[PDB]
């Protein structure tokens, strides 16, 4: 259906022990396709998905040039933010930045975003009009004033409505084989007696893509939550995702329970029972 | 494709 391109940046000061650590990663949907790590040997943007490797050296020089501009600007920002918040040069602080754009099934522009954080809290963010800013703090108002006056929103909006969307479409095209795919979950269920009184049914979904999924339990066809549990969706390490949900049941009652699985890769949702 | 314009110091 809908798609996104997103870049994630983290800068971490390590005072005395060198320049800040800087990590950039780019995603299309739930697939990483590029990375930059300041402590890696190449000092270049590097590919992480097959289809981006057909971009030529001009692309790789360009992305490397730009990503360094991101890095060196964050390095300045770390000093600035320390000042804004009257913090010691002792100790480590973090700048994070995320931006990107969403397009629909027909690849039309849906929205854009550009969010910035300091020490893991909202600092400033571009609103949905792609024209104005939400500043979290009194400190962030200074940034908001500067960026207003310097028309940062105008520059970012041009990217988010234009370049971002155009290159996302290019990427979706070039990596159709693997981005425009669904991997339906492989499911199964496991049962572990917690004693003689009760047991645990575990509903598994494995090897699915994209990450979006929903697992729910039912008792006698009615939605059960009170003694459920559901882990955070997790990467398998091969490009697909895993998730499970479990429930504890009095034994000789397992057959009362069904697990329901919904995923883009399934024409119909699955109903699972203990076998 | 990364942003080329609008990365400004805070």
């Amino acid at each position, epitope marked *: 259906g809908s798609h996104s391109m997103r870049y994630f940046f983290t800068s971490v000061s390590r005072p005395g022990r060198g320049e800040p650590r800087f990590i950039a990663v780019g995603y299309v949907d739930d697939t990483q396709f590029v990375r930059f790590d300041s402590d890696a040997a190449s000092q270049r943007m590097e590919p992480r998905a097959p289809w981006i490797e057909q971009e030529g050296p*001009e*692309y790789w*020089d*360009g992305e490397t*040039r*730009k990503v*360094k*501009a991101h890095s*060196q*600007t964050h*390095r*300045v*920002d770390l*000093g*600035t933010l320390r000042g804004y918040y009257n913090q010691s040069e002792a100790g480590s602080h973090t700048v994070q930045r995320m931006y990107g754009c969403d397009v629909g099934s027909d690849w039309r522009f849906l929205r854009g975003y550009h969010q910035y954080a300091y020490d893991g809290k909202d600092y400033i963010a571009l609103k949905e009009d792609l024209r104005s800013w939400t500043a979290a703090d009194m400190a962030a108002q200074t940034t908001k004033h500067k960026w207003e006056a*310097a*028309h*940062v929103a105008e*520059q970012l909006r*041009a*990217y988010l409505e*234009g*370049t971002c969307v*155009e290159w996302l479409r290019r990427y979706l095209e070039n990596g159709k084989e693997t981005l425009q795919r669904t991997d339906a979950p492989k499911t199964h269920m496991t049962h572990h007696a917690v004693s003689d009184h009760e047991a645990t049914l575990r509903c598994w979904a494995l090897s699915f893509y994209p990450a979006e999924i929903t697992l729910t339990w039912q008792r006698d066809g009615e939605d059960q939550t009170q003694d459920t549990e559901l882990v955070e969706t997790r990467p398998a390490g091969d490009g697909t995702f895993q998730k499970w949900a479990a429930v504890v049941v009095p034994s000789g009652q397992e057959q009362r329970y069904t697990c329901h699985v919904q995923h883009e890769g399934l024409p119909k949702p699955l109903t699972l029972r203990w076998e | *494709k990364l*942003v*080329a*314009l*609008g*990365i*400004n*110091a805070v």
Partner: T-cell receptor
Amino acid sequence: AQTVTQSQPEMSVQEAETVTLSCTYDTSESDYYLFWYKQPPSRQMILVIRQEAYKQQNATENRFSVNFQKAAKSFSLKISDSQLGDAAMYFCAYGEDDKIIFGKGTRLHILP
Amino acid sequence: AADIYQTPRYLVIGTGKKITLECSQTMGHDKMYWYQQDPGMELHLIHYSYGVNSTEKGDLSSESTVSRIRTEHFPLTLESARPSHTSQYLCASRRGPYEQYFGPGTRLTVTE
């Protein structure tokens, strides 16, 4: 290649006539700004025109105007009704967040 | 007008001398740049800066350094002047990716 090309290092124009200074560029990018600077005998770099790549209207400042042709990556500067005070170096230039890159410059003489 | 200042305006020094060219701006601009303009009038980027504590290398500067401990000041130091340092040195400040604002320049001659 991140280059700015001004192929004519010198040009002359009769006073009160119009001249076009040519400039093309190469870049991996679609988001950038373009500029023309004037540097008179004083050697002071002076901004003539700025053009945003995402703006379709051509920048104009009095007698100076640009012909921004993004698909051809061409960025001519037209000087109409040329004045003696127009005599200077003219630099075409390309900008992103990181830096501005300047062409080699064109010396414009005005024949009184 | 433009509030970016370079000193000295003119300088002649002997080969081997360590020299600092001053550049200061009180406009609150975060970014600053140094360009060497050789005879022939090409502008070559030497150093630049995204803000305080940022000192980014440009090209074959033989072998200069900059400091940026405060917004206002971006001094350029030549450690051991050479005759090839004979040039016009142009300092510029900048807001985001917009036009650079150049100071008036320092005209440096390094004599044998």
